[PDB]
């Protein structure tokens, strides 16, 4: 039936996964123990959780996600949290040694004797599943353990299983903030390996997430709890089609088919419109028109790109809550009459609408608004090239003076792979303008 498996690689990609499942357990009323109240919803694992959790005859919801990590501290800490009894123990795949931010160390040195283990996990997850539309891979481009470890495993799950979807989600590196100067090294290493096997790679950047916080959510001082909850809401919105229904229902197969124009480029941009404070939502009102304008207001995007510097190809709005076809279709019709929004002439239409009756709920101890009509805006535009354009000139300078290569040639690589990725990136940029040129 309608189910998928979530994968969280990298200790930065694990805390995001926990919050999502903490959010996920909310709308289903999951008690931390693992069971419902005396209300009868348990069975052979067949109810709203069947797409998400495995509350089988034993009565305990088993999340259908695997947590993989290479440093035991944080994964032990969450294993000492509140919902650890929900979690399957050795789905929390831990590690005793780190990759030291090295892509290849997380790809060659230790991955060989760990991939076989997680290979056993996925197959014994694969057999119990029925439809298993695809996977939910949470990672990071500049992963201290996220980058290299994900790379090889995504290769192996591609070669055995090339018939289903693979959904990729990584924090995009901050264009001007770099916690490590080796971050470009592994990041382009990820991209060139992932271009020929990844299905749908979705990115996000924290600075504009921070920028949102103190703009409209009015958060001068945020925490990951805020970040994790809001991104956890994002995946909740896109997965609401699986949980609930609506006037029409859409699936990841449609998202793949209708968003990506041509092979290689599969990197659209998400955005959630009703990101407002409770008090602001209190004495103000929400309707489709303003959220349609707000979702297309350039400063509301979390990627530092000006849409007027590029051109639009695909769009996707997922209206969750109490909406009618009437106002939406007229509103987007006005958007088509807009002159600023420069779609490419190739597509007369480039939007996919998802209508869901269920309104997004609040979380206890939360900071979001009380939304009745919500929408997640997934779009792809030519205004994304400057990102890798920023990356390449950062790389070429450092590569020319070949900084810290002694670290990498020290443990077993050569320059050829680092060479290949550059023209691969050069291939990507030229494709972007070639399709950018009408």
């Amino acid at each position: 039936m309608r189910e998928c498996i979530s994968i969280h690689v990298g200790q930065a990609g694990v805390q995001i996964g926990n919050a999502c499942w903490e959010l996920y357990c909310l709308e289903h009323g999951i008690q931390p123990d693992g069971q419902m109240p005396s209300d009868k919803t348990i069975g052979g694992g067949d109810d709203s959780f069947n797409t998400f959790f495995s509350e089988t005859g034993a009565g305990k919801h088993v999340p259908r996600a695997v947590f993989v990590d290479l440093e035991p501290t944080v994964v032990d800490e969450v294993r000492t949290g509140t919902y650890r009894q929900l979690f399957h123990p050795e789905q929390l795949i831990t590690g005793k040694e780190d990759a030291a931010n090295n892509y290849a160390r997380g790809h060659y040195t230790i991955g060989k004797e760990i991939v076989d283990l997680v290979l056993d996990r996925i197959r014994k997850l694969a057999d119990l599943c029925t439809g298993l539309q695809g996977f939910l891979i949470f990672h990071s481009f500049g992963g201290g353990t996220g980058s290299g470890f994900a790379s090889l495993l995504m290769e192996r799950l591609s070669v055995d299983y090339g018939k289903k979807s693979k959904l990729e989600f990584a924090i995009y590196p901050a264009p001007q903030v770099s916690t490590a100067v080796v971050e470009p090294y592994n990041s382009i290493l990820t991209t060139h390996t992932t271009l020929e096997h990844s299905d749908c790679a979705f990115m996000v950047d924290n600075e504009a997430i921070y920028d949102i916080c103190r703009r409209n959510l009015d958060i001068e001082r945020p925490t990951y709890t805020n970040l994790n909850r809001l991104i956890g809401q994002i995946v909740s919105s896109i997965t609401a089609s699986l949980r609930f229904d609506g006037a029409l229902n859409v699936d990841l197969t449609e998202f793949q088919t209708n968003l990506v124009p041509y092979p290689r480029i599969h990197f659209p941009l998400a955005t959630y419109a009703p990101v407002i404070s409770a008090e602001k939502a209190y004495h103000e009102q929400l309707s489709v028109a303003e959220i349609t304008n707000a979702c297309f207001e350039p400063a509301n995007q979390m990627v530092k790109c000006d849409p007027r510097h590029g051109k639009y190809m695909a769009c996707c709005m997922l209206y969750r809550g109490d909406v009618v076809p009437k106002d939406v279709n007229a509103a987007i019709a006005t958007i088509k009459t807009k002159r600023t929004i420069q779609f490419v002439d190739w597509c007369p239409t480039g939007f996919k609408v998802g209508i869901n009756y269920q309104p997004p709920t609040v979380v206890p101890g939360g900071d979001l608004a009380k939304v009745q009509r919500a929408v997640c805006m997934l779009s792809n535009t030519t205004a994304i090239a400057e990102a890798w354009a920023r990356l390449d000139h950062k790389f070429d300078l450092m590569y020319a003076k070949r900084a810290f290569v002694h670290w990498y040639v020290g443990e077993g690589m050569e320059e050829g792979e680092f060479s290949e990725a550059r023209e691969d990136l050069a291939a990507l940029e030229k494709d972007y303008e070639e399709v950018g040129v009408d």
Partner: protein
């Protein structure tokens, strides 16, 4: 006796048939449990045209539901009348379409066509003699077009002596949501023109306008839109089920309706659409019925035939009228705009009067038209296809499914021939 078996295809038809069937049950007065409440002998007399009977007085509908997505029919089954629908005829697949035409035409159909054919022949042997078949689907629907094109092709050689009624809704001209949408329609219409005998054309934009024009209710449900189209499709069916002097056979109609073989596209027409006060502010008279009947605003199908002219017109009247008011109105409409007809055919109107009104209103009518207003339609779909076939956007999927650009060439070429034909016969 002569009966009809219905086909419910595509996820749009999933709302259609359910709304289509419930009106009929309410029209005939069957309760949601299925136990009819016998009040009108004639509706008891003419229920065998569509429904078979089970034990305990529960009229089993002779319809088949087909889909791939379980969630849609679960809502349908959990609907007020799902119990009136059989677990038998609920046929489906274990696959997601991706809203893809090729998958539903070559990949997923293969393992399901066997089951659906085995189904329909079972109820085909259940009944005596069919007039034909009718299909509720969409030309732009990923599953409806994919299933329909396969099925109608197979049915053609199976029973080449019956009626292949096709009820398909055209997507919004301005907006299509689906971006491969022009591909899917062009693919389907290539086979549709070959296989069908009749086609209804429906669009939501006019339905949206009709909400603004006469419904006047700002925010309606899409189901009420189905209520409208179900009312339209029911009117043509009222002819068969009801006595009163009007000739009901669609073949009685189609031969008067179809001058040349490739004319399958026809437009609906309906009678009083009434608003807030007009219910108590209307003098319900055949003149004003005829007035509102022939209104470009009362038009709902595709676009205004004002851009073109009229080939064949046929209106069915339901209620207690007489031969003279229909006669004089036809004279009235003939004189008002004589040149707007085509000189090819004079007196091109076909009138049928049903003496059995609906339950709720007395004076009512339906109209079916074949005008020179479809040029803009396939002319419209021409430009997108040419521009999107110009640079073969969104093509790696279908080639991955096994199709090639060549099939596109004749599909548009056939449509181009239709452009000339619709142009040449009028201009």
């Amino acid at each position: 006796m002569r009966e009809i078996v219905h086909l419910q295809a595509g996820q749009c038809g999933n709302q259609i048939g359910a709304k289509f069937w419930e009106v009929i049950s309410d029209e005939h007065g069957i309760d949601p449990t299925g136990t009819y409440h016998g009040d009108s002998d004639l509706q008891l007399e003419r229920i065998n045209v569509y429904y078979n009977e089970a034990t305990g007085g529960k009229y089993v509908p002779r319809a088949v539901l087909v889909d791939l997505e379980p969630g849609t029919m679960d809502s349908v089954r959990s609907g007020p009348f799902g119990q009136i629908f059989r677990p038998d005829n609920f046929v489906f697949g274990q696959s997601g379409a991706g809203n893809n035409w090729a998958k539903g035409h070559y990949t997923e159909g293969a393992e399901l066509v066997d089951s659906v054919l085995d189904v329909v022949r079972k109820e085909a042997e259940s009944c005596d003699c069919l007039q034909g078949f009718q299909l509720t689907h969409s030309l732009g629907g990923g599953t409806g077009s994919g299933m329909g094109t396969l099925l109608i092709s197979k049915i053609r050689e199976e029973y080449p002596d019956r009626i292949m009624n096709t009820f398909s809704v055209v997507p919004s001209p301005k907006v299509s949501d689906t971006v491969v949408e022009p591909y899917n329609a062009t693919l389907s219409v290539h086979q549709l023109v070959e296989n069908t005998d009749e086609t209804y054309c429906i669009d939501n934009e006019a339905l949206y306008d009709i909400c603004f024009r006469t419904l006047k209710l700002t925010t309606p449900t899409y189901g009420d839109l189905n209520h409208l189209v179900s009312a339209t499709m029911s009117g043509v069916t009222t002819c068969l089920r009801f006595p009163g002097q009007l000739n009901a056979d669609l073949r009685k109609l189609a031969v008067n309706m179809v001058p040349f073989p490739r004319l399958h596209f026809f437009m609906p027409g309906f009678a009083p659409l009434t608003s807030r006060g007009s219910q108590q502010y209307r003098a319900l008279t055949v003149p004003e019925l005829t007035q509102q009947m022939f209104d470009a605003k009362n038009m709902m199908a595709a676009c205004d035939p004002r851009h073109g002219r009229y080939l064949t017109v046929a209106a069915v009247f339901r209620g207690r009228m007489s031969m003279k008011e229909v006669d004089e109105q036809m004279l009235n409409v003939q004189n008002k705009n004589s040149s707007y007809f085509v000189e090819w055919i004079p007196n091109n109107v076909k009138t049928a009067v049903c003496d059995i009104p609906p339950r709720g209103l007395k004076m009512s009518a339906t109209f079916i038209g074949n005008s020179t207003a479809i040029q803009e339609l396939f002319k419209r779909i021409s430009e997108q296809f040419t521009a999107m076939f110009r640079r073969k956007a969104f093509l790696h999927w279908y080639t991955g499914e096994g199709m090639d650009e060549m099939e596109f060439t004749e599909a548009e070429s056939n449509m181009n021939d239709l452009v000339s034909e619709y142009q040449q016969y009028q201009d």
